[PDB]
């Protein structure tokens, strides 16, 4: 009897259209970091096109940083279904905001990066405090307030100091609700993550930076 191919053959024809197709190693290495993140999106290729066509230095830097942190989090969350689910969700949310944003001159990505060594240390230090608060704790009113006290000064620092944010100084003085609301969103993200979750502590430690950066990216 006929082979499966023969039995399922519908036609044999020729085509003049059907055709096949024919080194920057640092770029290759960078692409592989981005791919780990962009896999979480609806369409990784569409993400790569947005990124590649952007001229927003700070926005691209924010995404690259996130992608690097995402790789670390995948290292630490791959043995727990709750943690990997959390990671995949923050990935999906971040990447969806990339597509919605478009990485033009005015972008949700870039303004909330630390622009001095001091600011970088403040961010690392607050991330470490968040981990202490949560492991000392749903979050209580105490813990909630302590999170607020960690996050609000960082957000306010960015508004005060940053040039990656393109807003006029005088106009930035209208944004007190921005800081309150963003810090509350951070509480909510941390509170939900804590609910869903030594191994756990390492999971939280890698997740905190992503949850925070995703909150920053959702600031209107």
């Amino acid at each position: 009897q006929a082979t499966n191919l023969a039995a399922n053959l519908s036609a044999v024809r020729e085509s003049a259209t059907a055709t096949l197709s024919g080194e920057d190693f640092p770029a290759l290495i960078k692409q592989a970091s981005l791919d780990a993140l962009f896999k979480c999106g609806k369409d990784a290729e569409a993400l790569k096109e947005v990124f590649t066509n952007s001229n927003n230095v700070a926005g691209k830097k924010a995404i690259m940083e996130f992608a690097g942190l995402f790789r670390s989090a995948l290292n630490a969350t791959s043995d727990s279904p709750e943690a990997k689910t959390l990671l995949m969700k923050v990935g999906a949310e971040y990447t969806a905001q990339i597509i919605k944003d478009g990485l033009k001159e005015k972008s949700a990505f870039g303004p909330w990066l630390p622009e001095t060594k001091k600011a970088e240390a403040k961010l690392e230090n607050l991330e470490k405090q968040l981990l202490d608060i949560i492991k000392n704790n749903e979050l209580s009113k105490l813990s909630t307030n302590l999170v607020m006290q960690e996050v609000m000064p960082y957000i306010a620092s960015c508004i005060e100091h940053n040039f990656g944010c393109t807003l006029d100084p005088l106009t930035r003085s209208n944004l007190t609700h921005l800081v309150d609301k963003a810090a509350a969103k951070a509480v909510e993200a941390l509170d939900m993550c804590h609910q869903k979750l030594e191994a756990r502590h390492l999971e939280m430690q890698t997740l905190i930076p992503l949850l925070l950066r995703n909150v920053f990216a959702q600031i209107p």
Binding site: L9, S10, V12, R13, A18, T19, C40, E45
Partner: protein
């Protein structure tokens, strides 16, 4: 490798496979030969500077589904392919679609029975890869 008539090779392999020879249209222009199939992507056969390639595009959403199924796809690739140079199928991308490709080893180009083994084997992998990307 040089007097090689790909149309005659294909015609002979399909005969070995028990194909209805009436389904075979005009092939002989030394373009890509295309086998259309009942529920699967079409199989393309082409000669590219003395290399014989068999390939198929795997579907409009294959690159997206690949984001979730890359491990299963890699395991499948690593299981090997006896009729391909290097013992392995290759993946590329054509028209925004993932492509499964076999650079056919010349051992499978000597006669129609041998080429039939390659074509039917490719069919089998096409089923498997396309289903893994569903």
């Amino acid at each position: 490798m040089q007097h090689l008539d790909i149309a005659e090779l294909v015609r002979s392999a399909l005969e070995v496979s028990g194909c209805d020879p009436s389904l075979i249209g005009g092939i002989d222009s030394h373009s890509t030969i295309v086998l259309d199939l009942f529920a699967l992507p079409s199989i393309c056969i082409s000669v590219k500077d003395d290399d014989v390639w068999i390939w198929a595009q795997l579907g409009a959403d294959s690159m997206v589904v690949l984001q979730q199924r890359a491990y299963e796809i890699l395991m499948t690739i690593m299981e090997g392919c006896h009729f391909a140079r290097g013992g392995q199928l290759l993946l590329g991308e054509q028209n925004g679609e993932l492509t499964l490709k076999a650079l056919v080893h010349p051992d499978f180009l000597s006669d129609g029975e041998k080429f039939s083994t390659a074509l039917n084997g490719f069919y089998n992998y096409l089923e498997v890869f396309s289903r893994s990307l569903m």
